[PDB]
Write a protein that binds this ligand. Structure first.
Ligand SMILES: [Mg+2]
Ligand SMILES: [Mg+2]
Ligand SMILES: [Zn+2]
Lengths: 293, 214, 152, 166, 108
């Protein structure tokens, strides 16, 4: 058994080694051409560096308004992270929170907020007890909350968190928001992913599911500081794109045997779409109600 | 209507350009081509009977190396003596506020005199002779910024180069010399080394009444 | 003290204020969209909607005819208030004009306004549109609305 | 006159060693003999001081002064020569380091007063100077905390020496 | 009443650089979604407004060409038809104003 600190630096070391391996895979500067086909600033060519430059780099070439209001990228029709390096000549279209159809931005925001909740859960409980994370399900943003399923210790099978503990979770999440960490992204081989999450069986199963879904068995790993998690899609650029955040409730799921999978639920809203206190309180209660997938 | 006119010491163009041959770099009518050349070479030796075209290529390489080394120290006086007035602005204007670090490692193959042509007499009483020389050397280049930051190239790494440098001497002038006039870059030339920064090409800035028609 | 003073001290006096607003109204009836200083446009907006109400009273009403004769200086617009504009708004009860703020005038930096009679034939103004129903906040509130409709 | 601000955009620095910080880009621009008062240009230039280039251009685009329009033109020109001639990569990675105004060469013109009297009027001209530096706008100096005020007080209660003795 | 003493540059800097005299920073600036130019969130976009105004001015120029003279407003309604558009059955008895361009995408 590695101590949780040693597991953290191990996973960080493997992540850094793989990222440096891709940066070594492309050593000589190569120039790609990205065509801006968004409505505003129409037909604008960016001449970018291959596997180095980002949709954020194109946004910095345009203006600070693009940098601060661009949450996702549409690279050749597919949703791209803003801090994910660009691999080919393509067409780009920056996606904001207040478009006509913000659905992919909503999904990316809900996945990012779930990831942060998972980091808080992993580093909240005391050293004696055992914390494992299964998955963050894809729950519609019309349901009321983002969710993470955590298997806790058998010493704490009878335990339910108090409101003080839930607010402590919320304070840790706000500490992450204040820390303002980029959401780093890595496309990786299933072998390297399995290596990173070797000591975690639920992560093995989920990695195998995503690797089965894609032909070359490349999965998506995101890192926020020292936490690394497997994802089911792109994420928002920074933890500071959260303004209102709350870990609302913890619900114990039906089949208690063989083990207790506990659903931690939360609700969040960005800086660009922040709500008043009355409306946010009502959203808090509706997130405290249980979400079913 | 003054009797004083500008005493130009060069021309503004290339006399009967050497269309570089396709395959000259990929592979490691001739009588007329080398006929025009011999006729002209004799014209040059009419104007100075101590010229050897077997002696030019080493002189051309020396002029090349010393001119481009002036670009390193900014010795514009020596440059005006080893390069023409047509070649001075398009060698200095883009480096004015930049630091150019150039070097000559070696020569892959010896230089060849590959074309010699001469102008007519009716250029103001002045007759010019223009000689094309092929070069295939190995050079280094590192162009720095106003603030000392790298823009282009690598400091130590030598890279191969093929250039068709056209030298010119004004033959009627009593103190004329062989100086670098232009150089031909082939239309089939390999693409140059990529730059070290990202570039945004702006789209059409449209007036409000205009509509973006792709 | 100017408590409960609903009108503006405009122009060279009260008649001058009425004549400035009359010329603004004549321009609005002729062109169906004009731009002017913002305060003048507000003060005129009220009169623009009462003019449509008199037009809806109609051309055989002698009071309505007299009032249109006063407020329309060009006299070709009186047939137009009664046989074009008043009919366009026979279905609406009272919301006939739209007033919006347009930048600032580039001579004296005055607050400016555009006013249009709804309907129109002109290109549409770039109206302020609320946020879409598909944004994050609106989707969360619709989830709240559906759950309330279920629970009650 | 003196025109030293335009020779500042011509300092060539020695090439940098490969282990040193990158050295941000500096761009000096200025407009001379503006028909405006320096005392009103001061408020416009103190408003755009320390801002990002885009934030500055927003504030100047919606400010109501003739000087705001002139300073917008000067800022846009400076951004263009930044990424045209000084090798700035992103045109949004700039901030206003310095923004001031100077007196220009003015003209004196008589202003007929009553009686038999005259006043001399000044046709005022000004200069506007701007230095752009590559980078994000630097973080503002945070306000002093009670802990920082107390630590300063205790340093002074501990720096006290016995005066005028051995 | 005249100044009894000259006012110093220190007193004058306090008066002229007091925060009340400084320009306040604005926070109502937002990007227009349709053109990307900067707008104030309570005022119509300038670029879009002058686009609309220039098309309206062309339509008003053609209206006067048809009306032909002063005091000749119509008693019927009006409709703007572009190149390649026939009058609709609803746009029957309406003065048709023809314009020699494609219908702008923002005009319906
Ligand atoms: Mg008045
Ligand atoms: Mg007199
Ligand atoms: Zn707009």
């Amino acid at each position: 058994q590695l101590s949780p600190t040693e597991l953290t630096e191990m996973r960080n070391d493997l992540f850094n080694k793989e990222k440096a391996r891709q940066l070594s895979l492309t050593p000589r500067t190569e120039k790609i051409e990205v065509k801006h086909v968004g409505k505003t600033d129409p037909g604008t060519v960016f001449v970018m560096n291959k596997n180095i430059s980002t949709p954020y780099s194109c946004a910095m070439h345009l203006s600070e308004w693009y940098c601060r209001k661009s949450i996702l990228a549409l690279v050749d029709g597919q949703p791209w992270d803003m801090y994910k390096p660009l691999t080919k000549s393509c067409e780009i279209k920056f996606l904001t929170f207040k478009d006509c159809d913000p659905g992919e931005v909503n999904k990316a925001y809900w996945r990012s907020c779930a990831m942060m909740m998972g980091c808080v859960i992993e580093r909240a409980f005391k050293d004696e007890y055992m914390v494992n994370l299964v998955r963050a399900p894809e729950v519609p943003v019309i349901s009321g909350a983002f969710c993470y399923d955590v298997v806790l210790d058998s010493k704490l099978d009878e335990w339910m968190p108090t409101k003080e503990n839930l607010r402590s979770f919320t304070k840790d999440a706000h500490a992450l928001i204040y820390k303002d960490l980029p959401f780093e992204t890595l496309e990786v081989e299933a072998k390297v992913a399995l290596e990173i999450f070797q000591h975690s069986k639920y992560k093995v199963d989920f990695i195998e599911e995503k690797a089965s879904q894609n032909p070359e068995r490349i999965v998506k790993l995101h890192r926020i500081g020292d936490f690394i998690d497997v994802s089911e899609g792109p994420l928002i650029p920074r933890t500071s794109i959260c303004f209102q955040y709350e870990v609302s409730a913890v619900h114990n799921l039906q089949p208690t045997q063989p083990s207790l999978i506990r659903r931690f639920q939360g609700v969040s809203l960005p800086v660009h779409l922040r709500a008043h206190f009355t409306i946010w309180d009502k959203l808090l209660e509706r997130s405290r109600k249980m979400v079913t997938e | 209507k003054s009797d004083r006119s500008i005493h130009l010491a060069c021309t503004a163009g290339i006399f009967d350009a050497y269309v570089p041959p396709e395959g000259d770099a990929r592979i490691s009518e001739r009588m007329k081509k080398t006929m025009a050349s011999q006729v002209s070479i004799r014209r040059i030796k009419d104007y100075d009977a101590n010229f050897k075209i077997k002696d030019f290529p080493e002189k051309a390489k020396d002029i090349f190396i010393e001119a481009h080394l002036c670009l390193n120290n900014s010795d514009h006086d020596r440059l005006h003596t080893l390069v023409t007035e047509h070649c001075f602005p398009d060698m200095t204007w883009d480096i004015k506020y930049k630091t150019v670090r150039w070097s000559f490692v070696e020569s892959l193959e010896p230089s060849h005199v590959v074309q010699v042509r001469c102008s007519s007499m009716m250029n103001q009483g002045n007759v010019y002779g223009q000689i094309t020389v092929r070069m295939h050397t190995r050079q280094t280049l590192a162009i720095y910024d106003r603030f000392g930051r790298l823009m282009y190239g690598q400091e130590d790494v030598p890279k191969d180069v093929l250039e068709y440098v056209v030298f010119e001497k004004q033959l009627t002038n009593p103190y004329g010399s062989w100086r670098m006039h232009t150089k031909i870059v082939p239309p089939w030339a390999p693409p140059k080394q990529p730059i070290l920064k990202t570039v945004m090409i702006p789209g059409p800035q449209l007036k409000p009444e205009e509509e973006y028609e792709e | 003290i100017s408590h409960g003073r609903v009108f503006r001290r405009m122009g060279l006096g009260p008649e001058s204020r009425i004549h400035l607003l009359r010329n603004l109204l004549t321009g609005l009836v002729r062109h169906e969209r004009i731009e002017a200083p913002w305060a003048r446009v507000d003060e005129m907006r009220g009169y623009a909607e009462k003019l449509i109400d008199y037009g809806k009273l109609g051309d055989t009403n002698e009071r309505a005819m007299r009032m249109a004769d006063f407020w329309l200086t060009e006299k070709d617009l009186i047939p137009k208030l009664f046989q074009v504009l008043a009919p366009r708004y026979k279905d609406q009860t009272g919301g006939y004009t739209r007033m919006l703020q347009i930048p600032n005038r580039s001579l004296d930096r005055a607050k400016m306004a555009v006013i249009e009679y709804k309907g129109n034939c002109l290109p549409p103004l770039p109206l302020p549109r609320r946020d879409s129903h598909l944004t994050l906040l609106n989707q969360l509130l619709q989830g709240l609305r559906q759950d309330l409709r279920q629970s009650q | 006159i003196s025109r030293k601000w335009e020779k500042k955009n011509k300092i060539v620095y020695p090439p940098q060693l490969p282990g040193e910080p990158r050295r941000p880009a500096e761009i000096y621009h200025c407009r001379r003999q503006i028909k405006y008062s320096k005392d009103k240009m001061w408020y416009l230039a103190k408003l755009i001081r320390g801002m990002s280039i885009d934030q500055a251009l927003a504030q100047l685009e919606f400010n109501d002064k003739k000087g705001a329009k002139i300073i917008k033109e000067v800022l846009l020109e400076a951004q263009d020569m930044a990424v045209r001639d000084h090798n700035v990569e992103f045109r949004s990675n700039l901030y206003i380091a310095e923004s001031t105004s100077g007196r220009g060469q003015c003209l004196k013109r008589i202003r007929y007063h009553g009686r038999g009297r005259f006043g001399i009027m000044e046709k005022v001209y000004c200069h506007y100077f701007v230095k752009l530096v590559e980078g994000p706008p630097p973080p503002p100096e945070p306000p002093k905390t009670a802990v920082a005020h107390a630590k300063e007080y205790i340093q002074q209660l501990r720096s006290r020496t016995i005066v005028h003795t051995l | 009443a005249a100044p009894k003493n000259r006012r110093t540059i220190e007193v004058n800097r306090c008066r002229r650089r007091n925060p009340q005299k400084l320009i306040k920073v604005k926070n109502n600036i937002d990007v227009c979604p349709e053109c990307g130019h900067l707008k104030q969130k309570h005022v119509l976009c300038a670029y879009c407004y002058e686009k609309v105004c220039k098309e309206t001015a062309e339509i008003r120029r053609q209206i006067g060409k048809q009306e032909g003279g002063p005091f000749k407003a119509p008693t019927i309604e009006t409709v703007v038809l572009y190149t390649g558009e026939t009058p609709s059955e609803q746009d029957q008895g309406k003065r048709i104003i023809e314009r020699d361009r494609k219908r702008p995408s923002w005009f319906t």
